Amino acid sequence: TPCTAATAAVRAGIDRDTAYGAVTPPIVLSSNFSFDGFGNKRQYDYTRSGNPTRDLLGEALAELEGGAGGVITSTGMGAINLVLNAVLQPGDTLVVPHDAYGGSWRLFNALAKKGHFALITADLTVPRSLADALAQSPKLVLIETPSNPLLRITDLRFVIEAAKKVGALTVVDNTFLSPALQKPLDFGADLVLHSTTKYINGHSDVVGGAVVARDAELHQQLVWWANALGLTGSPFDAFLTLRGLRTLDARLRVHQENADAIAELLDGHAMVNQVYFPGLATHPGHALAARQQKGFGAMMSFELEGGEAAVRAFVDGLRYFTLAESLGGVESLIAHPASMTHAAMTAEARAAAGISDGLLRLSIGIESAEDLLIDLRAGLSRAEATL
Amino acid sequence: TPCTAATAAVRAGIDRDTAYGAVTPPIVLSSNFSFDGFGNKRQYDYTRSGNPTRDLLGEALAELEGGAGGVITSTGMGAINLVLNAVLQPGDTLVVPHDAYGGSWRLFNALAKKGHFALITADLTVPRSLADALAQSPKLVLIETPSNPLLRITDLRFVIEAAKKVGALTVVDNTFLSPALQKPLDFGADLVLHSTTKYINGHSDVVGGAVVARDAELHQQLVWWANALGLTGSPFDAFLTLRGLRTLDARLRVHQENADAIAELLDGHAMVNQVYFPGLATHPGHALAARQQKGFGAMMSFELEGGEAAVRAFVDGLRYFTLAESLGGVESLIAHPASMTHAAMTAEARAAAGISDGLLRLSIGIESAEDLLIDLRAGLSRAEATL
Amino acid sequence: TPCTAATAAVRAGIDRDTAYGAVTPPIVLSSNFSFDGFGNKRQYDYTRSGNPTRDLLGEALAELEGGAGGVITSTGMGAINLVLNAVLQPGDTLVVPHDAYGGSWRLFNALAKKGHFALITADLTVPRSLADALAQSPKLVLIETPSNPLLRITDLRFVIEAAKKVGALTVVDNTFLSPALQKPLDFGADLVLHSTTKYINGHSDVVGGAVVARDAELHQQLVWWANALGLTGSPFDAFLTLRGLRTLDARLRVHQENADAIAELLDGHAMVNQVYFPGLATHPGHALAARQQKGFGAMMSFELEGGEAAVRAFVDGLRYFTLAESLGGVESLIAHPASMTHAAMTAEARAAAGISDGLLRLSIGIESAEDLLIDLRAGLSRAEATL
Amino acid sequence: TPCTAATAAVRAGIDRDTAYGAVTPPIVLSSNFSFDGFGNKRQYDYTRSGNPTRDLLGEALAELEGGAGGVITSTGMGAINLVLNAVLQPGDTLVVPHDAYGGSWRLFNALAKKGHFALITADLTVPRSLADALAQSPKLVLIETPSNPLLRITDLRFVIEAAKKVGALTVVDNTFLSPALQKPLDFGADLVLHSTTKYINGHSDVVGGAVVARDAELHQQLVWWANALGLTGSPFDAFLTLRGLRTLDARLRVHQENADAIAELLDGHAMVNQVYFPGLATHPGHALAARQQKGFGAMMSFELEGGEAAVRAFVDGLRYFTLAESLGGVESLIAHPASMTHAAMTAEARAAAGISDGLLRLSIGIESAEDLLIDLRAGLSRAEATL
C-alpha cells in the first residue's frame, strides 16, 4: 500500500543515504560531480542542472501534488518565470487573474510590455470574464486560489475544463494552501507552483520556488529551461526547505485551529467592517473552498472601521503579529497590502482587484490561540479609542 | 499575561535583530567580536565563552523550564559532564539511577573508577533504596524520569524533598518529555538538563545538550565551567535547534496522538508479553506521571512473545520505523537497547536495570497514525508466524 | 589611501556587525524584515529584493571591479539571463562571441529562436567579423575573454570603443580570470558578470552568479529585474562565496605558479600537438593578455597526439585531476569540452568555434606543482604507450 | 610518491563520496545512522561517537601531523580537556609551561585545585626548571611552542627525550604554527593538539579543537573518552574547518611574507622597546625555531616606548588590525593579552610568565603588506605624538 501525504512529507529522504545510512539526508553542496571514467556521466554532473539534495525536495513536492516531477527555483517569482519561459513565446496569449499577488502582476505586465506574450487580465470567478478570455485562444491560463490578499476562490474543475476545451495549459499557484490543503493536479491542471518561502518551508529562513508538472514531457521541458536560464535553487535552501516540509501537516493543524478562533473574533466585532476568510459561510467562495480544499487555511484579511487612524492604532502595539512581508511562517505576521505586498501594483490595478487602502492581511502562526486573541483584542480597543 | 510555553518556543529570537530587523535570527558563527576601543569588552568577546545565537537557545530553554539561565553544550553527555565537573570534586558522593541511559551509566562508572567522586547507583522509584543512598550524605542526586528505556517514573516531589532534607543538590535529565511536558524546576530541582538531540531539536540533524539552573549563581558557575572546559556548542547547531524548538508544541500533539493509538494496539495484543508506557492505567507510575507530567509522551518499549526469532521477524520489514539509535525525531525509530542504546552497559548492570535481551524501544514520530499501525500490525504477524 | 583590491577582498564584511561587533559577518537567512512601525520600511524588507549578507558580496565584487553596485544571482547562467532581460527587447540585436561557453551559446540560441532578440554570432578577435556585427546597430555586445575553452583573447579597449561608437552597451563575462586578474570596467565596459561558482567562491560548493554595472542607473535596473524575475541568490551561498573571496589573491598566486610549471611541461612535449594558454609567447593573444590582464591565469587546454585512444589512456589513471565539470576550485580538474562543458553546442557550432573532439581542458588547482606534474607525466606515458 | 602536505590538505575529502561522486564532500549532519538489519551496526551509528564529515577532518589532520588518527572536539580547550581526562587520574602529576595560553593556565589550575592531578608549572625553555619538574616523575608533560603570547621556543628533541627517560607522555599544543609549519610527532611526542579555531580553519567562523595521537591504541582511548564525555564537535563546523584547511598552505605563504615585513618595521623602530618574533636573528630561540619549524609563522608581540598612553594611541585608529581575541584568521587582529587573552590569569602568573601590561600581540593576516605597514606606521606616529 502507499503511505499518506503526511507520512511521505515526514519521511522524504529518510534512510536514503547509500554512503553511511544517515537517517537524515546529507547536504550535497558540491557544484560538480566526478565522471566514472572518460565518457561516463554519473546520474549528477553539475548542480545548476541537477543536485540530489534539491531533487529530494522536488520529488517530495511531486509526490504530495501527484505530479511526474518537481523543479526547485531560487524564488517563487522564479518558479512563475520558469513557467512563462518554458511554455510561452511572442504571439502566444496568457490569461492571469486580476487579483493575483502584486509581484505576479509586476512580472506579467513587465514581460507583456516587452512583447514576450500578449496578456489578458481577467476575473476568473466571473464566467463572462473567463469565457471572453478563453475565446481569445490563450496558450496558458494561470489561477491563484485562494487569491492574495482577498481570498477570492476560483473553481479549479470549471476553469481547468474550460481551458482544456480551447487547448490552453493551466498552471495553479498553490502557495496560500500548500499541497497539504489543495491538490490542483487532481482536477486536471497541467502545472502547480509554489513560493516554498511560505508554508512548505514554514520558518521564514528560505526564499524559494517549486514547479510540479502532471506530465513527464512537460517536467523534462521545465528541467531543460531551469538549467539553461540558471533559475535552479541552492542545495542548502533545499535542505532547510525539506526539513521544514517534515512539520507542514503538524504546523497546519495548529495554524487552522488559531485561524478559526481569530475569524470568530473578527467577524461582526463592532470595529470590523469586513473579514475575507473562506472559512466563514458568508464569504463568496466558502462552499467552493470546502469542496476543492481539505481546510480553510490560515490567511485572512479584514477592513477596520475608522479609516487610516484606526489602522495605525491597531498595528502599533501588536506584540505577536510582526509587521512584515511574507506568510506561512510559524511566527504570526501582519501586512498592509497597499503599501507592502501589493505596492508593486499601480493604484488603478489595486482598485480593479478591490484591494482598499484600509486592508490588513494576517498570516496566523502557531502560537497559542489565547495569546494571539489577547493581542488582537488590544488592537481592536486601540482602534475603537480612535473614534 | 506573560505568554504560554508554546508561544515562547515559537517566538524565541523572532524580531530580535537590531542590525536589520530580521524576523528570523541571524546565525552568528564568528569566533570573535571586536572591542569597543582599548579596554571596552562588548557583551560578546569570544564564542567559546558566550555567543548570541547560542544564548537565544539558552534563554528560550530557561524560559520554558522556569530557570535563571541556560548553557548549551556540544552534546547531551556534555551537559551531564558539565554538571559533574561544576558541582562535584573527589570526596563528594553522587547518587544516580540504576536504569539511566547507558551512556550516562558509562560516564558515571568511568569517572568514579578514576576517583572524581564516589558513586551510589540506586532505584530512585523505591523508598528503601532512596533512603539508603540519602543516608550517605550525597552532594548531588541525578534523576532520569521517565527512564530510558523502561519508562520508570521517579516521584519528583518525593525525591527532591528527601534530597533537600540531607543537603543534596538535585539534577533532572528531562530529555524524554522535554520542557513542554515536565518542568522539574517547579518541583524544586536545582538543575534540569537535556539532550537537545531529541525532541527539542526534533529533526535528527544536531547533537547537543543544555543545562538550566534554577538559581542565577549556579547558572554563572555552569557558564564559567563550560567556558573553562570548552564544552560549549556550535552557533550553527544552536540555530538549527532553535528552529526545531519552534515546532516542539505542534510536533508533541501528533507524537502523543500517535503514541496513545500505538499503546492501545500493543497493550493486551496476543503477541505482546509486556508494554512499558506511562499512559497505560496499569503501568506502575501512571498516576504519578498523570500529576507531575502534562502528557505521557511518545517513548515506549515492549517485549514480544516468541524469543529472539520473533524479535528478528518483527524488526525485518518495518517500513516506517527506522532501526537506529536516538529518539524524539519527527521520523519514527526502533531500537534494541541490549545491542544499541545500552550496549555501553555490562550484561550485569542491564540485568540490575531489568533491560532484557528481548526489549524493543519505539520513538513514535509524527507520520499518519494509520501508516504506523499498519506497519506495527504486519510486524506482529511476522512475529506470530515464528511459533 | 583606499586599501588594495586584496585588502578589500580579505576584509569584506569584517567588523561590520552593529548588533554584537562580530568580526566575521552573521548569516541573515531571514526571508523577511520587520517594518519600524506602520509605513516605515527599514533598509531591507524581503530577501528576494535585497538581503544584507548577499549585499556584502555584491558590494565587495563592485569594489573589486570598480562599479556602482553588484547583483548576486542563483547561478552564473542566471547572471547572463538577468543582463539579457534587463537590457534587450524584441527587435534589439545582440552580438555574442562564436567561442563563448556552450551554456551561453545554448541560452543565446534558445531565446533568439523564441524571438526575444535577433542574434549575431561573430569572431570578436577578427576586425572584419566585428565591424560587420557592429554595422548592424546592436543594443548589446557580450565579450568572453579569455574564451572557454580555447583561451582566445579579445581586445577589451578596441571592442568596447567600437561598440560605444555605434551606441551599443558592452558586457564582459570575466569568469576565467576573476576581478583579481582583469578589470573590464577600467576599459569602459558598461557591465561585467561572473559565474561566482568558479574562482571567486574557489571551493566548488556554491553555484552562483554576479553582475556589476559601471553606472548607478543601470545597477538600479538590474536590482529591479533581479527582484521581478526572482533570479536573486540564497544568503547562505553569499556567505560561503564571501568566505571564499577572502582567499582569492592567496589562491591565485599558487594557481598561476602551478599553471606556469604545467604549460612548460605540456608545450613541445612530444605527445602534445597544441597548448592553448595565454602565458605562452606563441599563443595568439599573448601580448594582449599581458597588457589587459595582471596574470595569465590557470585555465589551459591542449590536444594530444594519438586520437581518441590517447585521450582515454591520458584521462583514466589521473590521481589529482578529477574528471569533472567546472573550474576555478582549489582542486585540480580535467574536462573534455566536446562531451562535457560544450556538449550543449551542436557539432556545427563547436567546429565553427574550433573545439575538436580531442581537446582537453585543465583547471589547475593549488596542490603542489610537483604532485600535479608527476600526475601529468604519467598521463603522457599512458598516452605514448597507445602508439 | 605519497603527496606533499599542501596536496593532502587541498584534496581531503575530494572525490570521496560513494553516493553521487560529489567532488566536494557532503555535509553529514544526521545524529543517527540506520542499522543494516537486526544486530548489524554500519561503520557509523551515532554522530557523538563517530561522524564521517568530522572523520574527514580527523584523518586529514592525522595525515598532516603523521599520526594514527584524529579526534575533533567542540573547542580547542575541549581538546586539552580530552587529553587531561584520557591520560591523567588523581595521584598523577602534570607538568605544563609557565607561559601557556591563559585559558590553558585556568583549566590546569581549576582541575588541580579539585584534586584531578598534581600540577607543576615550569619554564620548559630553561634546562634546570625542566629537570626539577621531570625529577617528580610526571605522567604527562604539555609543551606549547611557540608560546602565547611571548613566542618562546621550547626545544622539542630536548624536552621530549628528557620526558621519555622518566616515563612521561608528551603532548604539544601546535596551535600557533599548524601542521604545515611544525610536526611535534616527528620529534617523538605522543600527542599533538590544536585550536582549529585559528590557522587550520583560518576564517574566524568556527571554534574547534583536534587531538592527533602517534599510536593507534592511544588514538582509540581518545575516541572512547571523547565519546563518553561528549566533547566531539559538530559536523557543520568540521565541514567549514576542512574547507578552510584546503587554503592553509596558500594562506601561510602570504601570512609569512607579511609577518617578515612587519618584523622588519618593528625591530629597532625608535618607538619599539621590544619585538618577540622567532624569525628575528636576535630572538633567543631563533636558531632552534629555524631547525624545528618550516617557517617562523605570523604571530608576534611587541612593547612600545611611552607607557599606557602610547599603547592607547597606537591602538585607537588601526584600520586593518581589528582589536579582538583569537588569531590565525585571514583578517589581521590585535590583542592586549593582560586585559583580553590572558585576563583569566592572576597578575602574579602573568608576572611569572613575564607578560607585561604594555604587551600588544599581532595576528598578521593576508591583506596587502603595503596596507598593513601604512596602518602600523600611522600607529607608531600616534604613539610618538604621546611623549
Ligand SMILES: Cc1ncc(CP(=O)(O)O)c(/C=N/[C@@H](CCSCC[C@H](N)C(=O)O)C(=O)O)c1O
Ligand atoms: C501567491 C504568491 N506567489 C508567489 C510569490 C513569490 P516569492 O518566493 O517571494 O518569490 C508570493 C509572495 N508573496 C509575498 C511577498 C511580499 S514581498 C513584496 C515586497 C518586495 N519588496 C517585492 O518587490 O517583491 C507576500 O504576499 O507576502 C505569493 O504570495
Ligand SMILES: Cc1ncc(CP(=O)(O)O)c(/C=N/[C@@H](CCSCC[C@H](N)C(=O)O)C(=O)O)c1O
Ligand atoms: C536520557 C538521555 N540523556 C542523555 C543522552 C545524551 P546525547 O546527545 O546523545 O549526547 C541520551 C541519548 N540517548 C540516545 C543515544 C544513544 S546512542 C548510544 C550509542 C553510541 N554508540 C554511544 O556509545 O554512546 C538513545 O537512547 O537513543 C539520553 O537518552
Ligand SMILES: Cc1ncc(CP(=O)(O)O)c(/C=N/[C@@H](CCSCC[C@H](N)C(=O)O)C(=O)O)c1O
Ligand atoms: C564562462 C562562463 N560563464 C558562465 C558559466 C555559468 P554557471 O555558474 O555554471 O551557471 C560558465 C560555466 N562553465 C562551466 C560549467 C559546465 S557545466 C556543463 C554541463 C551542464 N550539464 C549544463 O548543461 O550546463 C564549465 O565550463 O565548466 C562559464 O564557463
Ligand SMILES: Cc1ncc(CP(=O)(O)O)c(/C=N/[C@@H](CCSCC[C@H](N)C(=O)O)C(=O)O)c1O
Ligand atoms: C595556544 C592555544 N591553545 C588553545 C586555545 C583554545 P580554543 O579554541 O579557543 O578553545 C587557545 C586560544 N587562544 C585564543 C583564545 C581566545 S581568548 C578568549 C578569552 C575568553 N573570554 C576566555 O575566557 O577564554 C587567543 O589567544 O586569542 C590558544 O591560544
